[PDB]
Symmetry: C5
Subunit: 367 residues, 5 copies
């Protein structure tokens, strides 16, 4: 309108996008970098990649994009696309995206004082170490490391502002504890110039109820069936079939769990160790029961001729609770297996009750 | 043709795409923003992202793209590609797309009065909160928030026009109740200039029959089997195997349901709670029946020696309906479990009959 | 070669790609639009999107790209890339692609008379309504709607030529009946100028044998098992287990079918209704048999004390074919269920034998 | 270095990338097209698309990119990016890629004689007809059709050179027999100018052992179980359950096979026909055995009253090998079913032993 | 700031990005190429493609990008985007990416001496031969081959620097042994000019515990069940059903294994051969037991009439350990099958204990 056109013509008369916009070349350019978390799209524990929906916020002063408001009435701000003016090269250092730059290059808003505002949105994919050991009561500290790609501390004085979380959409699987930020420096051996960066640590807590019932109901059922087969009579007929079916069902369930979560060898989840203990206990009990039944139902003394087993079973039954002796030995072994399974379940429950994600507090908040 | 070429040469003589095309720089530019919904591609409840096929509609007046029709006979409209002329930076604020701009940049149609028309098509992916609690009788209000990225109310006077739905292709899984629109403002603490935006709320109702039979037939079958095992005699032989098989089948079905829909911890679906109640009832009944049978078939009084259980069962049988006492106690427990399951089914049906998506009206319209 | 270089320099001396190449600006530009179908990549019934491999064919006369062959010996054609010259903005209106333009922008072939040829290949993804109701004997009419995005009938006189199918690679799942074309106009209320478009209707017939055996063999097996359990004696022992296993297997098969095809609520497939009828019949028969066996094996008259059931069963047995009465009643009920299942199977076969995709003709052509 | 810079400035003084670089415009430009296969990424039998990793090789002489080596000491070659100089528009005609051009546009290497070298790498996706009928002993001839998009034989004299396979990485699922090439012409009715193209036929043989054990072990097991149930006594008790379980397992296996490979209706695989024959035989045998057992175990003559069945069974037993007659008839039927299954297995093995991929030679080479 | 702008204007006065920046054109340009491995994203054994997160490091001296620091106070470094200055065309030769260039083109950092630094990040997908034969104790040597695409050894003197691994994030499935580098030359028959390249061999060891328990627990269970059925009495009733169920479960497990890993025919994994041996042993044992039971339970001598079998079984029982003879023969056959299975398990364990990935050392380090 005879003023905006003239201003746009005048501002880019000799402007060079490659030049860092400072009046004095030996002075640093202060850039205020902030963040606006909006949504946690995905937490891939397989590839250790966190996907988030983030609006970056960058602000700096341009020495050449200044004008007198009185000389250009009615126009107070101008917009420049990607390549028209200089922008800081703030990139996510730990970006796992195949493009390495998920930001959408919007226009830079500059007002009459030369203050530029740049808010590039994007779906950032950052590679963070997923420590899945206290499954499912685990908290992940995924870091977002931002910094200038080719500017030092004496050229781009990067500064930090607290991230904005008043736009956040709850994920439904992870609970956002918070996203604190920190500014650190990267002094090199070559040179005394610092290399600042801004790191935002997305502290997230896994929501219990998402996997809670879906894993507890099968686990409760298989534990009840294990107790049942540890209490059923030896000569019941269906005990062997029930045990085999239970083992097949729970190993298919464990295969499904390993398909959903990754059973990373860096730190085996405690649930996997509990399952392994249950498997070895159930297998030993079933093998002992089957061999006793198949070696003592037809021959009264076919496998009972060793003396060491007889004396050790007598000592164990005297130290534990005190048709032939084979039935009593099988019952004692089954009771011992039941006691061991109960002790393991109790100790696992005790060890999982206390943790950094307080189980009692979590269930009180959820339920 | 000696007139279109001359007009195109004349129109871009001093035109600047960065300049907002207003005769007076202090006056707002009125932009009419409308929408044309065509198809609902996908409703991802996992990532809370809605995918739609939408044709945007933007209209504004350009002060510099005006010409005299008599001076240029035969030409009444001109087209300019993406970067040739100025276009409003209307973007989907809640876009979850990795590109953040799904629009296809078509040509801007300008006629002799300077009126520009811009209709960019695209497959928009917006992040909306999916409240899946009354599954499957749920209605989702997914919002599409459009607004200028870097213009205020005194620069780009955004206006709303009612969305066009006379091109809509039915989804087959979701029923489109409607897409009302609203224009709101975003006054900041810094400044009195409003920041208008246009929000279209895609109100969608899940079609019943899509998941209806596929979830009812397994649910009806498992409920019938639960009633059967709650009515079968205790000493039937196959009762334990039937119960275990039923539990395995329905827990696999629940795993499939959790695979298809997300069991979000924000609000657990009522179907999940009903399944949990059925699971606890069936497990308790099976455990009680098995323990009674295994502790009373060989010993007439091996687990019946406690007095509290005997007196409480006598009181319950006197207050409910009034071979040894163990069979009668097992029958009473089984009848109580059947009654509890029937009451839970009835109350769940009553609570799910009434809702915002009226169940009776929905089935009347569908069937 | 001193002539091609000179011609290329001369042709683009004042050429404007934005100008429509007509000698008279008030005269329409005739553009002949044709199509060359090559392959049907995918038919997504979930999102209602058809993916095809298509070579477009556009021809028009350019007034400015003309030269004298004698003055430029040896050169008869020239090529111009995307942005060098004017091309019609013919786009797929119902494109479901995220880019909205799957065409690969090749060079435009222009000869000495100004006749331009443009053949952009691409993998088009168009959104067509998939009416899957007569599964698997269904024919889909997916339309490809092409037209100018910003030109009317008095500016771009779009014309149609018959599509070329002598390059088509058979899909193996769908049979191509044909792709007829049609040209229609879109008169607006504003103005009398028509808005022509060219629509190609890809009429495709699903090949029977692809899903034929894969669905018939499980269906034949489950139908045979249903007849078997409807003919087996009540006191056989394995009847209940066989029925439960059959129901579980066929409901898993129906889950697989719903996973492969979409059970759209717009029109439920007839196979789904047949499965629902079979399910209700089998469930009723199994429930009746189980309740009769469990209420009459131990008590000669425990559930037979009502008079209405006895008299109605006597009337039914007198009107149908004419150890205690319970066995005869169970046999009569089982025979009635078998007869109902046979009638339903016969009527379903009769109703599916006749259709627009003639079943007898299809199997004669395939087998 | 005062010579490379001068040469680069001089070479592009009047160079036009649109001009075909020939001294005489009426003379063809000879382009030598070769190929360098590196890896067969994927063979999609569903969409009939072959994915390969290929380095193209194009060579031609540029008349204008010539210089005197003595006048420019030290520089013998120059490089030009995509748009700087002219390149042939050699494209894969049958490309199924959504971009239609998988080549990565590298620099063109030109030496002092004007000879240009262009080696664009890419991951080509070509649509070839997959004839999967002799599964798994099948050989696929997938063609790669390359040619100029807009040049005739009198403008671009395309020539063929033998493909290079000394970089090939074995796929592990397909064995590369060879990739012969051929040059053909495409004379049109309009004009006598030929339209040459270069076609490379990727002849590939499926490696036996990849699917060999994975399909043979289930097939061997189900065949052994079929023989077992065809040899087990009728009154064994578990015969019906074993047969039903075998049928369910093998139909799930066939569902898995149809999920992995496509059961295309163009030509049904022989394995599918063998499975159908086995299914009908097993179903008939099971139905006959069950009906005989259920109609003759309680009534000595309840279904044996027809005379035609009795006389035909007497004739068959006299012509085949020569408690009541029902057991003998059931045994004769079971033996006949076993003989039919054995004959079908033998004839299938004989017919699959001989083929273009010689089974004996293949197993000798592999084992 | 009156110095950076002047320097940027002066540096690109006559700069040509196509020219190789050397003072003398006949002298090679030394380029130091290094690598910085950060993460191993994926190891696809199906397509033989390795996905890694890598920061490249390239350094070279530019003759024209030099300036006097005193003449331009305060500015010591400059940045140029992709197309502004010359960069080496170092590409991954064995790249399997569809783009062939995963690098993100950042700015080139040049200081006053003309020394340029280029650090392009990217997610590289390279095609390496995956030799999966000693599953799961296998080490993969995946090579990353980098080199100039169109420069010889006398033009681009490529040099190697040791890769940096102090940023590496552990994968959790693969253990990084190391990434040694090597520089080699590619002399051609045409010419004596070498063609150097830099190859980094990513030596990776599969972590045991990732698949360890998940494959051992099913394998241990099926081995225990095989021993059980090889020790159970012949006339146990459930032996046949248990064997069939075990076979079905383990063949489903093998199908799952073939789904996860590829059973490549180049070299069959030892686990597959062990499974095949177990399958043939179990099948033979089950068939022999079933045929003996079905041919000797009703007829004392119905299949024992041959003399060769009787004499060979007598010899075997005399050479092995020394109701009718059929039971003793069945027991001897079952014991022989058990012994063969035990020998095969022992020899497989012995052969898998020793390997390049030392099993004992690996389990000592992990456990
Ligand atoms: C241009 O925009 C900047 C944005 O920061 C304005 O700077 C702010 O001005 C207010 C005065 O109302 C101060 O309270 C803030 O502290 C300033 N922020 C910073 C970072 O300096 C600046 O005033 C604007 N220019 C004009 C002419 O209005
Ligand atoms: C250019 O196009 C605009 C499109 O809006 C025309 O403006 C409309 O003109 C009609 C008159 O037939 C009015 O009824 C509408 O209310 C106008 N709409 C708006 C938004 O102003 C305009 O007339 C066209 N110019 C010419 C010269 O025809
Ligand atoms: C340029 O190409 C066009 C292609 O259509 C030629 O026009 C055709 O010419 C033939 C004469 O051999 C006629 O039979 C066709 O009917 C014409 N087609 C159309 C659409 O007009 C044209 O002749 C070519 N120019 C020259 C100089 O050869
Ligand atoms: C430029 O490169 C071409 C590449 O082909 C050279 O042409 C080859 O030259 C050799 C001589 O050593 C002949 O044996 C080949 O037959 C030629 N090939 C072709 C296709 O003509 C050419 O000599 C090079 N120019 C210079 C000046 O060395
Ligand atoms: C420009 O950067 C290069 C980076 O290598 C500098 O070269 C290094 O200079 C140091 C002196 O402090 C030497 O120890 C290294 O050996 C040099 N490296 C190489 C590869 O030559 C160079 O000095 C810098 N220029 C200026 C003016 O500081
Ligand atoms: C802006 O212009 C006014 C006159 O229009 C003048 O008084 C004022 O000093 C100017 N400001 C600057 C910063 O030049
Ligand atoms: C357009 O031109 C005609 C003469 O050709 C003139 O009468 C008319 O006033 C002009 N209109 C405008 C708006 O300049
Ligand atoms: C082309 O040039 C020839 C002479 O070379 C002339 O006779 C002829 O008329 C010209 N044609 C046109 C259309 O100008
Ligand atoms: C190249 O230059 C030399 C002199 O430097 C001259 O003798 C020779 O003829 C020239 N070659 C050509 C092809 O012009
Ligand atoms: C740089 O400039 C200073 C004077 O400012 C001069 O003494 C010195 O020699 C110059 N260096 C070069 C390399 O030209
Ligand atoms: Ca996840
Ligand atoms: Ca499909
Ligand atoms: Ca494949």
């Amino acid at each position: 309108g005879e003023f905006q056109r003239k201003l746009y013509k005048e501002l880019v008369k000799n402007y060079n996008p490659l030049e860092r916009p400072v009046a004095n070349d030996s002075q640093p350019l202060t850039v205020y970098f902030s963040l606006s978390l909006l949504q946690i799209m995905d937490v891939d524990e397989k590839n250790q990649v966190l996907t988030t929906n983030i609006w970056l916020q960058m602000s700096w002063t341009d020495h050449y994009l200044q004008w007198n408001v009185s000389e250009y009435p009615g126009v107070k701000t101008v917009r420049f696309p990607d390549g028209q003016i200089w922008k800081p090269d703030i990139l996510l250092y730990n970006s796992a995206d195949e493009r390495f730059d998920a930001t959408f290059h919007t226009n830079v808003l500059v007002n009459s004082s030369g203050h530029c505002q740049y808010l590039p949105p994007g779906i950032f994919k950052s590679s963070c170490y997923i420590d899945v050991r206290w499954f499912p009561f685990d908290v992940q500290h995924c870091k977002l490391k931002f910094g200038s790609w080719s500017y030092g501390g004496w050229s781009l004085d990067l500064q930090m502002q607290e991230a904005d979380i008043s736009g956040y959409i709850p994920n439904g699987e992870w609970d956002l504890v918070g996203i604190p930020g920190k500014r650190s420096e990267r002094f090199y051996e070559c040179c005394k110039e610092p290399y600042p960066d801004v790191t935002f640590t997305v502290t997230m807590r896994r929501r219990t109820l998402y996997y809670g019932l879906n894993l507890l109901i099968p686990c409760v059922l298989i534990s009840a069936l294990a107790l049942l087969v540890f209490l059923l009579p030896a000569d019941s007929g269906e005990k062997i079939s029930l045990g085999i079916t239970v083992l097949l069902s729970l190993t298919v369930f464990m295969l499904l769990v390993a398909e959903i979560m990754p059973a990373t060898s860096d730190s085996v989840p405690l649930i996997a160790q509990y399952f392994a203990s249950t498997m070895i206990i159930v297998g030993l009990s079933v093998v002992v029961t089957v061999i006793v039944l198949q070696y003592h139902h037809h021959d009264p003394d076919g496998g009972k001729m060793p003396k060491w087993t007889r004396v050790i079973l007598l000592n164990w039954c005297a130290w534990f609770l005190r048709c032939s002796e084979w039935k009593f030995a099988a019952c004692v072994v089954d009771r011992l297996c039941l006691m061991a399974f109960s002790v393991f379940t109790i100790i696992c429950t005790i060890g999982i009750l206390m943790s950094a994600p307080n189980f009692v507090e979590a269930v009180s908040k959820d339920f």
